[PDB]
Design a protein that fits this description.
2 copies of one chain form a homodimer. By secondary structure, the first copy, chain A, is mainly α. The first copy, chain A, has one domain: Winged helix-like DNA-binding domain superfamily/Winged helix DNA-binding domain (Arc Repressor Mutant, subunit A, Orthogonal Bundle), CATH 1.10.10.10. Chain A has 6 helices and 3 strands; from the N terminus they run H-E-H-H-E-E-H-H-H. Chain A has a 3-stranded antiparallel β-sheet. In chain A, strand 2 and strand 3 form a beta hairpin. In chain A, helix 2 packs across helix 3. The radius of gyration of chain A is 17 Å and the shape is elongated. Chain A starts with a helix and ends with a helix. It is classed as unknown function. The entry lists the keywords Transcriptional regulator protein, Dimer, sulfenic acid, unknown function. The assembly is dimeric. The entry is titled "Crystal structure of Staphylococcus aureus CymR oxidized form". Chains A, B: Staphylococcus aureus CymR (oxidized form).
């Protein structure tokens, strides 16, 4: 419950910007294209990230962006929370607590993964 | 992604039976009533659990059940898997792996929680 779609694409946006930190701007147009999204949809993700101070537009670029805060200071959890943010009454207290334990395990993974870490992941 | 509803109710069924292990049967009727489900829906959860050998009907009880295997030998993960069982191509490999890490963390919680543990949880 669940990977919100906004969160996923927002994370991708941030990873792209992180790979460029201190190099210049990336256009919304290029990110939208790269990720099969409308610029309009991307715009809805940019808003909250900009408002939180994590990214900023570059003047005169007609929709160019860069990290405002260094990638090592931002967690995947931070990003998901900004973009994304069920009980069954009859459930036994033990079972309800099990779901809490799983939730917390996920949160731990998310909160302890930095954007810098995601940017520098090495693959074939 | 997500707690399947079948899994949740199946887990609840199993916890109820576990609280009774070696005491006698519990009627499907009582479990359905206790949990705001139709007997018919419950029947769909019972089928796979019975087929896996985890529970068994009691003869002549017109729909009475008991654990067939001890609660300490069964994990929440086992139960969910029996009852319950998404990729976005453009996602960076680092992000795809993040989702795998979260999945595994959840699996760890689920696989290392026994039904006996859930049955003996102590609350106010």
């Amino acid at each position: 419950m669940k990977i919100s779609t906004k969160g996923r694409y927002g994370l991708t946006l941030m990873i792209s910007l992180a790979k460029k930190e201190g190099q210049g701007c990336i256009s919304l147009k290029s990110i939208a294209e790269e990720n099969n999204l409308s610029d309009l949809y991307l715009e809805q993700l940019v808003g909250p990230l900009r408002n939180a101070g994590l990214i900023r537009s570059v003047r005169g670029a007609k929709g160019g962006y860069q990290l405002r805060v260094p990638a090592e200071e931002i967690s995947a959890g931070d990003i998901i929370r900004l973009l994304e943010g069920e009980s069954i009454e009859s459930e036994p207290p033990a079972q309800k607590q099990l779901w809490i334990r799983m939730r917390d395990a996920v949160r731990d993974v998310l909160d302890n993964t930095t954007l810098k870490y995601l940017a520098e992941y090495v693959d074939t």
